[PDB]
Amino acid sequence: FDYHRIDQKLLQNIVYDALVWSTLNCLLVGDKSVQRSGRVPGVGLVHLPLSLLPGPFPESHWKQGCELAPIFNELVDRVSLDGKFLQESLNADEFTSRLLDIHSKMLQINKKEDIRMGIVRSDYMIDEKTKSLLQIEMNTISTSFALIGCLMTGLHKSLLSQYGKFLGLNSNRVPANNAVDQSAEALAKAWSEYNNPRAAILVVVQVEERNMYEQHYISALLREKHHIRSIRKTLTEIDQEGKILPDGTLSVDGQAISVVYFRAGYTPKDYPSESEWRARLLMEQSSAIKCPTISYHLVGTKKIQQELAKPGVLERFVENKDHIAKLRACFAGLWSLEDSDIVKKAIENPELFVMKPQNIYGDELRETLLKLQYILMQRIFPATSPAILVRDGNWDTGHVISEAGIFGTYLRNKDKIIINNESGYMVRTKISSSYEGGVLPGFGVVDTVYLT
Amino acid sequence: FDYHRIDQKLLQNIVYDALVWSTLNCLLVGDKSVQRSGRVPGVGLVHLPLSLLPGPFPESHWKQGCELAPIFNELVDRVSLDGKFLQESLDEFTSRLLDIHSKMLQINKIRMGIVRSDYMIDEKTKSLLQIEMNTISTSFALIGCLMTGLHKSLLSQYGKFLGLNSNRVPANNAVDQSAEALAKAWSEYNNPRAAILVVVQVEERNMYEQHYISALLREKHHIRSIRKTLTEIDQEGKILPDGTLSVDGQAISVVYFRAGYTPKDYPSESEWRARLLMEQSSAIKCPTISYHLVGTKKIQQELAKPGVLERFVENKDHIAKLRACFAGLWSLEDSDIVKKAIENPELFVMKPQRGNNIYGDELRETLLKLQAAYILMQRIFPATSPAILVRDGNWDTGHVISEAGIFGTYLRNKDKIIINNESGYMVRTKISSGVVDTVYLT
């Protein structure tokens, strides 16, 4: 539990076994210290920064997270259908306006689109004040670590099967994890639904990609288990090598494409020029099934996510009131500054709130608000646990917080729901902020959880 | 097979896919240039230097080496038992091994081996000739069967194009068969509480092959193993009053050597002390000192001389098969061991039994003999081929020779032979003037 209290020489032994297991099972990324490692496979590898042993996490809250996956998949789909709400909700960012311009084009064009799909991830923290599972992000596009998360389950299970009796820990409390398998399953099923067995899956990847093995592992599952071919291209390669055939088919680099799996294009930095925007548009207009579509990408935007957490909004996209209960239970309170909602703007207890754009804490929060002569939200107070953190072959102790991402997969064809699944998980673990760490990284370490 | 023809663009793609496959499947080693990579797992990793696509190798000759695997297992076990032949036929390193063996001959108290016979196809004849018999610490059981996987994967993706069929790359179980051999020895020894000690080098950039074997042991066979250097064994190992080997809290029933074959492995008396200790223990050595001595260059030369091989093999068919793969080697019958070599010196080489080799017009040393480098052998002319070589993520073309290494596994109780197997392969490929490979049958 307090892993800091385990004998140092024993910890070295466990760390050595982890570094071994990591290499044998490709828990590896290109080393950012090595020049070509985000471009040339096979060179400059290092194990992922990782937490040695999983931190605890209540089984009741784990289950709540499980339950919510398919309910989130369905919300994301319904919200994406409401073009007017998306357009109306979304003033000043250039990138979001560029995405809205594509969405507006699609609204104009008004093409059928019977087949829709998502590979998404809802991220949660446990909150100490309330003792509640709270959602901190909904990731609707290009979500990573389906392989990484499920290799971490493999690792932690392996370590606990050897060192756990002594430690009083049982590997069967690390939840089972099928994430990467479920990912490729959803892509394979969408490729089948399209029913063009001559087509490949296109994966859209970044120019520099030191997590390329995850994507190759997927393509491998596609090739070997599912018998589907795939190709990888950057948005600019697509602009250069892509076109729409007479029947609407996407063709890239000579190959018919039935599914566009995005592992890029979620960030402004992936669109350095008009080339990348042309590609995004081309692909959206074509008949290929996108994973996901532009309206889905819009749904995970910050402003949309904030909107849904306001009074009665969520309630426009969900009719099952048990689902609305479960959703609202994981939503951190959020408010418009104006009216205040019942004037909890009247704030005396600013330690309990946060202001966010579309952050301001404590006293700065209190001043800002002044009883006025961007939104207000419930402050979250995370759980801490003593971790062992292993990075570039070395280890140290740290007190950390953790954020559990629960993947969802979804696939439908008209009104037929083909997949709507909780699809495994990942965990991101970070040194506290009350210690030498904070928020300012390379992006913590990977982890799992230990139920209850 | 003429891979130099394939256009740069396509090659570049096949290369990309091989580097991907290598990373995903742990065809990886510690990078020489990263100073901690031989000691700390998980850091400074790079794919194995490799040949992109297999070289041709006749099926008939592949089957010959297959058949020879269990014949060589039995030959190794019979020669090892002739203590005085070994002492008699047989340098500081070699004499320290001899010291350990004579000592066990004195003491006079289950046997196993995981070995590998290396061959090359000779152009002069068309023969499969043995070039080495490795009796101790044979590497590349994992690497060899991962290259099998890589090549079958590439020829699945690119085979139809180039007119190659992934099914002409032979099947390969080498690492599984190694772990199986160890697991069975552990069982024979019948101590459910004993571990397997694996003896490792101080710096081991190929540690993942060994880690994979310990992972099979743990997960498939439910056997614990522990890895130690010879000096760690000196410091930590003890023989109990009942003669049993104890190393960090566990009895040791099998000592699997992945070190100890090279003098660099014995920087001090500590390592020499650990080797003796373990040899004198009741643990099963994979292999014993006697096996180690059978693999020496001196014993291998001796065996290849006329009449000698035949003293250690009863079976006439095996004698025939063994002689077929043996390159001629001689002391001094003037007739072959010299008149034939003076005519046709191009077909022969003189080599020290331990100075430069002698060939062509020189080999006129023999006219000199009136009818450094001493023992005459048949010259081998290797069957080269066009290769793509991939190293540190870059590729180039080269013309190469290949050495096919056939692993054998063997185990026995007193007259019962539990295992005597051909057990998969590896291939080492190097410039015409190295890298890991497979073969394409025929």
User: B370 and B241, same structural domain?
Assistant: no
Interatomic CA distance for residues A401 and A309, integer angstroms: 24
Number of CB atoms found within 10 A of residue A343's CB: 10
The alpha carbon of residue A17 is apart from the nearest alpha carbon of chain B, in Å, by 9
- From B177, B217, B208, select the one nearest B26 (Cα to Cα): B208
Which token pair is A115? 């087949």
Measured between CA atoms, the residue of chain A closest to residue B153 is: A224
> Length of chain B in residues, anyone?
442
The CB-side HSE value for B340 (13 A sphere, CA atoms) comes to: 16
In which element (H, E) is residue A103 found? helix A94-109
**B47 contacts A216? CB cut-off 8 A:** no
Give the per-residue SS3 of chain B.
CCCCCCCHHHHHHHHHHHHHHHHHCCCEEECCCCCCCCCCCCCCEEECCEECCCEEECHHHHHHHHHHHHHHHHHHHHHHHCHHHHHHHCCHHHHHHHHHHHHHHHHCCCEEEEEEEEEEEECCCCCEEEEEEECCCCCCHHHHHHHHHHHHHHHHHHHHHHCCCHHHCCCCCHHHHHHHHHHHHHHHHCCCCCEEEEECCCCCCCHHHHHHHHHHHHHCCCCCEEEECHHHHHHHCEECCCCCEEECCEEEEEEEECCCCCHHHCCCHHHHHHHHHHHHCCCEEECCHHHHHHCCHHHHHHHHCCCCHHHHCCCHHHHHHHHHHCCCEECCCCHHHHHHHHCCHHHEEECCCCCCCECCCHHHHHHHCCCCCCCEEECCCECCEEEEEEECCEEEEEEEEEEEEEEEEEEECCCCEEEEEEEEEEEEEEECCCEEECEEEC
Per DSSP, A271 falls in state: -
Q: Report the SS3 class of residue A452.
A: coil
Q: Are residues B277 and B198 in the same domain?
A: yes
Which token pair is B40? 């700390």
**Rounded distance between C-alpha atoms, residue A5 and residue A385, angstroms:** 12
Amino acid at B296: T
Which chain B residues are within 8 Å of A22, Cβ to Cβ? 41-42
Residues B163 and B123 in one domain: no
- B230 and B285 share one domain: yes
Burial pattern A120-129, b for ≥16 Cβ within 10 A else e, equals: bbbbbbbbee
- Token pair in block for residue A90: 């979304």
Using CA atoms, how far apart are residues B437 and B358, in angstroms rounded to an integer? 31
With both helix axes pointing from N to C terminus, report the angle between B207-219 and A8-24 in degrees, rounded to the nearest 10: 100
- Specify which residues A334 forms β-bridges with: A377
Asked whether A428 and A447 are in contact (CB, 8 A), the reply is yes
Q: Cα separation of A391 and A24, whole Å?
A: 17
Q: Which residues of B touch A157 (CB under 8 A)?
A: none
Supply the CATH number for residue B338's domain. 3.30.1490.50
Measured distance CA(B215)–CA(B213) in Å, rounded: 5
Q: CB contact, 8 Å: A231 with chain B? A: no
Identify whether the C-beta of residue A360 lies closer than 8 Å to the C-beta of residue A367: no
Output the CA–CA distances (angstroms, integers) from residue B54 to B1, B57, B121, B153, B169, in the order listed.
8, 9, 15, 12, 8
Return the closest-CA partner of residue A29 out of A446, A336, A425, A316: A446
C-beta pairs of B309-314 under 8 Å, 24+ apart in sequence: B309/B75, B312/B75, B312/B78, B312/B79, B312/B82, B313/B71, B313/B74, B313/B75, B313/B78
- Alpha carbon distance A121, A123 (integer Å): 6
Reduce the DSSP state of residue A156 to 3 states and report it.
Answer: helix
CA distances from A212 to A27, A179, A263, B38 (A): 12, 17, 10, 25
Quick check: A69 and A282 in contact, CB under 8 A? no
Per-residue tokens: B171:
């099947």
DSSP A92: -
Residues of A in contact with B36 (CB under 8 A): 393
Closest Cβ opposite residue B42 in set A22, A36, A217: A22
- CA-nearest of A206, A212, A157 to B24 is A212
Burial class of residue B347 (count of CB atoms within 10 Å of its CB; 0-12, 13-18, 19+): middle
Cβ neighbours of B339 (radius 10 Å): 13
Q: What is the dihedral of CA B200, B203, B205, B208, to 10 degrees?
A: 30
**d(C-alpha B272, C-alpha B294), whole Å:** 19
Q: How far is CA A330 from CA A229, A351, A356, in A?
A: 39, 20, 18
- How far apart are the C-alpha atoms of A310 and A391, rounded to whole Å? 41
B184 touches chain A (CB under 8 A): no
Given phi > 0 = left and psi -120 to 50 = alpha, else beta, which region is B315? beta
Half-sphere exposure of B91 (CA within 13 A, CB side): 12
Judge contact between B399 and B432, C-beta under 8 A. Answer: yes
Backbone angles phi and psi of A193, in degrees to 5: -55, -40
**Residue A451, helix vs strand vs coil:** strand
Question: B335 is in which domain, residue-wise?
Answer: 329-384
Name which of B9, B17, B24 to mutate to probe chain A: the one with the most chain A Cβ atoms within 10 A of its Cβ.
B24
Question: Under an 8 A CB cutoff, do B44 and A46 touch?
Answer: yes
Asked if B41 and A26 come within 8 Å (Cβ–Cβ), the reply is no
Cross-chain Cβ contact A47/B47 below 8 Å: no
Judge if A37 and A168 occupy the same domain.
yes
Residue corresponding to tokens 């909700």: A89
Q: Give the whole-angstrom CA distance, residue B177 versus residue B175.
A: 5
**Residue B108 burial by Cβ neighbours in a 10 Å radius (0-12, 13-18, 19+):** exposed
Look at phi and psi of residue A443 and say left if phi exceeds 0, alpha if psi is from -120 to 50, else beta. left
C-alpha to C-alpha distance for B76 and A175, rounded to whole angstroms: 50
What SS3 state is found at A342? coil
Say which DSSP state A31 is in. -
Residue of A12, A19, A45 to mutate, interface with B, max B Cβ within 10 Å: A45
Query: Could you tell me whether strands B195-199 and B250-257 are parallel, antiparallel, or unpaired per DSSP bridges?
Result: parallel
- Does one domain contain both A195 and A291? yes
In angstroms, rounded to a whole number, what is the distance separating the alpha carbons of residues B120 and B2? 19
Residue B228 near chain A (CB below 8 Å):
no
Chain B: closest CA distance from residue A327 (Å): 38
Residue A24 and residue B392: Cβ atoms within 8 Å? Answer: no
Number of domains in chain A: 5
| 3 state SS of A419 | strand
Q: Which two tokens stand for residue A232?
A: 């990888």
Instruction: Locate A252 and state its tokens.
Output: 């890239």
Coil, strand, or helix at residue A89?
helix
CA distances (Å), B396 to each of A292, B16, B152, B391, in order?
Answer: 40, 13, 21, 8
| Spatial contact of A197 and A126, defined as CB atoms under 8 Å apart | no
Judged by CB atoms closer than 8 Å, whether chains meet at A43 and B211 is answered as: no
Residue closest to A304 by CA, chosen among A100, A168, A119: A100
Last residue of a domain, one of B295, B316, B338: B295
CA distance A259 to A219: 13
Q: HSE, CB side, 13 Å, CA atoms: give it for residue B387.
A: 30
Burial of B5 (0-12, 13-18, 19+ CB in 10 A): exposed
Rounded CA gap, A177 and A154, in Å? 8
How far apart, in whole angstroms, are the C-alpha atoms of residue A5 and residue A399?
12
Is there a cis peptide before residue A292, judged by omega within 30 degrees of 0?
yes
Quickly count: other Cβ atoms within 10 Å of residue B372's Cβ.
10
A234 near A205, Cβ under 8 Å? Answer: yes
Q: Using a CB-CB distance cutoff of 8 angstroms, which residues of chain A are in contact with residue B393?
A: 36, 40-43
The residues, any chain, with a CB within 8 Å of residue B94's CB and separated by 6 or more, are B296, B298
Question: Which of B90, B82, B80 is CA-nearest to residue B112?
Answer: B80
Q: Tokens for B32?
A: 């020489």
**Tokens coding B169:** 């790359």
Shortest Cα distance from B25 to chain A (angstroms)? 7
Q: Are residues B16 and B152 in the same domain?
A: yes
Residues B378 and B412 in one domain: no
* H or E segment and range at residue A68: helix A59-81
For A217, phi then psi, to 5°, come to -60, -45
- What CATH number is associated with residue A140? 3.30.470.20
Last residue of a domain, one of B384, B408, B427: B384
B357 at interface of A, judged by CB pairs closer than 8 A: no
Closest by CA position to B230, among listed B247, B205, B249, B217: B247
Q: Say if residues A72 and A138 touch (Cβ distance below 8 Å).
A: yes
In this structure, the answer to whether residues A197 and A270 fall within a common structural domain is yes
DSSP string, A272-331: SSHHHHHHHHHHHHSSSEEES-HHHHHHTSHHHHHHHTSTTTGGGS---HHHHHHHHHHS
Count interface pairs A-B at CB distance under 8 A: 85
Q: B418 Cβ partners below 8 Å, 6+ apart?
A: B184, B188, B411, B412
Stretch (H or E) spanning A445: strand A445-447
Report resolution (Å) to 1 decimal.
Answer: 2.0
Q: Give the separation between CA B398 and CA B178, rounded to whole angstroms.
A: 32
Q: Which of B183, B255, B137, B97 is nearest to B411 (CA)?
A: B183
CATH code, domain carrying B25: 3.30.1490.80
The Cα B46–Cα A399 span in angstroms is 33
Closest CA relative to residue A294, chosen from A307, A312, A280 = A280
Neighbours of A159 (CB within 10 A): 22
A148 labelled as ligand-binding? no
Nearest-neighbour CA in chain A from B259: distance (Å): 19
Strand partners, B425: B406
Q: Which of B62, B152, B110 is nearest to B419 (CA)?
A: B110
Instruction: Assess contact for B3 and B53: CB atoms under 8 A.
Output: yes
**Side-chain-facing half-sphere of B398: CA atoms under 13 Å:** 20
Q: What is the enclosing helix (H) or strand (E) of A335?
A: strand A334-336
DSSP 3-state assignment of A41? coil
B124-128's contacts with Cβ under 8 Å and 24+ in sequence apart are B124/B347, B124/B379, B124/B380, B124/B381, B126/B58, B127/B61, B127/B324, B127/B325, B128/B61, B128/B64, B128/B65, B128/B324, B128/B325
| A168, A43: one domain | yes
Q: How many residues are given for chain A?
A: 452
Question: Measured between alpha carbons, how far is B74 from A110 in angstroms, rounded to an integer?
Answer: 78
Nearest CB to A42 within list B19, B207, B211: B19
Take residue A426 and report the two structure tokens written for it.
């990942």
Task: Please indicate, yes or no, whether residues B322 and B306 belong to a single structural domain of this protein.
Answer: yes
A19–B40 C-beta distance less than 8 A: yes
Residue B36's closest chain A neighbor by CA? A393
Q: Are residues A45 and A159 in the same domain?
A: yes
Long-range contacts of A221-228 (CB under 8 A, 24+ apart): A221/A180, A221/A181, A221/A184, A222/A184, A222/A187, A222/A188, A225/A184, A225/A188, A226/A184, A226/A185, A226/A188, A226/A191, A228/A187, A228/A188, A228/A191, A228/A200, A228/A201
Question: Packing angle between helix A146-167 and helix A212-224, nearest 10 degrees?
Answer: 100
Using CB atoms and an 8 Å cut-off, which of residues 30-69 of chain A contact chain B? Answer: 31, 36, 40-47
Method: X-ray
Q: Cα separation of A53 and B31, whole Å? A: 28
B393·A28 Cβ contact <8 A: no
CA separation for the pair A328, A431 (Å, rounded):
29
DSSP A190-240: HHHHHT-TT-EEEEE--SS-TTHHHHHHHHHHHHHTS---EEEE-HHHHHH
Instruction: Report the alpha-carbon distance of residue A167 to residue A148 in Å, rounded.
Output: 25
Q: Do residue B43 and residue A16 have CB atoms under 8 angstroms apart?
A: no
The answer for residues whose C-beta is within 8 angstroms of residue A135's C-beta and 6 or more apart is: A122, A123, A124, A330, A331, A332
Cβ(B140)–Cβ(B405) below 8 Å: yes
The CATH number covering residue A89 comes to 1.10.1080.10
The answer to whether the beta carbons of residues A446 and A429 sit under 8 Å apart is yes
